Design a protein around this ligand. Structure first.
Ligand SMILES: [Zn+2]
Ligand SMILES: [Zn+2]
Lengths: 197, 202
């Protein structure tokens, strides 16, 4: 590929018009023009955030990461970028497992990639950066031989929209958790502990 | 139902009341007992107003008075694209009251807006107030006053928080450059010249 990157990779290091390519052979950034592997905008993802309660099942993979915590879910409703960043990553890569964690009164998200080969399209990165601007760090690392994108919130700025929290909590409480989703969290128990600590 | 003192900061809002301003006085009324809200239909939320903010370049004619308030400043227009609450608040007020004239100005990259009501009788529905407070929260003050015998809502920005969306500024600026300014809009600004200069000290 075109150029090695150092891990952990903070997305503030993103070179315009490049994709990230992670494989067992190395960690690289490549020209989007030259990329053989190569989506919604941050605005689209904000509309989806606004419309969450109309799309609970559609966004079920997101809500599993809360592990039925009403407290975490409430925090998410004050922080659109958590949902926005998941939504963007999910569009480019379905084989992901997000886990949410609160620290210092703020919600943070770790997105665990199931497969060892991971391509992050340029168009995904640029939209994540829009969603993350100022108040979040977004970093890619390999942790326990898994690619993980960590979304850490430094400050929670006022959101100028309100979600119906009660409706959202009720729908999340009612969701079934499939066996394979519970199993994946158990698989990743040591990984999740490392990320959170 | 009850007299209010001006200036009225919207953080003083009594739950489930409307504001009614007329030559006879400045009052807050129970939303249940309000006859103006009997007639009207369900107004947009702060969420609807954010979707409108996102979709601005598709709705230029509808929101034309918003853009006239920039008085042709590309700098002020650009700032508005980093501060959704300015547009949101205008959108919310416009839904409840079409006869308004917004005027914008900036300090140190923080955009402010004053909304001048054309008519001396002004009704601010409860539902409008609550959505404005959602849009404003933390970073803006929203105040109602009578200034030079005009009802004016002032939206003052204390801090600009990060916005997690980006508008196509270039497209918006080109659409704004292309708008014609009707004679009566230019005339209204000249009518309000002294009012605008009074409000601009904030
Ligand atoms: Zn690519
Ligand atoms: Zn009313």
């Amino acid at each position: 590929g075109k150029e090695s990157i150092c891990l952990p990779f903070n997305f503030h290091s993103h070179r315009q018009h490049t994709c990230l390519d992670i494989s067992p052979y190395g960690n690289e950034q490549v020209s989007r023009i030259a990329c053989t592997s190569c989506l919604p905008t941050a605005s689209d993802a904000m509309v989806a955030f606004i419309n969450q309660t109309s799309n609970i099942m559609k966004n079920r993979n997101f809500y599993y990461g809360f592990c039925k915590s009403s407290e975490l879910l409430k925090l998410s409703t004050n922080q659109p970028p958590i949902f926005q960043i998941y939504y963007l990553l999910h569009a480019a890569n379905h084989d992901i497992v997000p886990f949410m964690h609160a620290e210092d009164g703020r919600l943070h998200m770790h997105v665990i990639f199931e497969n060892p080969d991971v391509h992050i399209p340029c168009d995904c990165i640029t939209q994540m950066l829009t969603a993350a601007r100022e108040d979040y760090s977004v970093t890619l690392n390999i942790v326990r031989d898994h690619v993980v994108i960590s979304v850490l919130c430094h400050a929670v700025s006022a959101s100028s929209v309100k979600i119906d929290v009660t409706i959202l909590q009720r729908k999340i409480d009612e969701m079934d958790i499939p066996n394979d989703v519970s199993e994946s969290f158990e698989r990743y128990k040591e990984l999740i502990q490392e990320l959170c600590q």
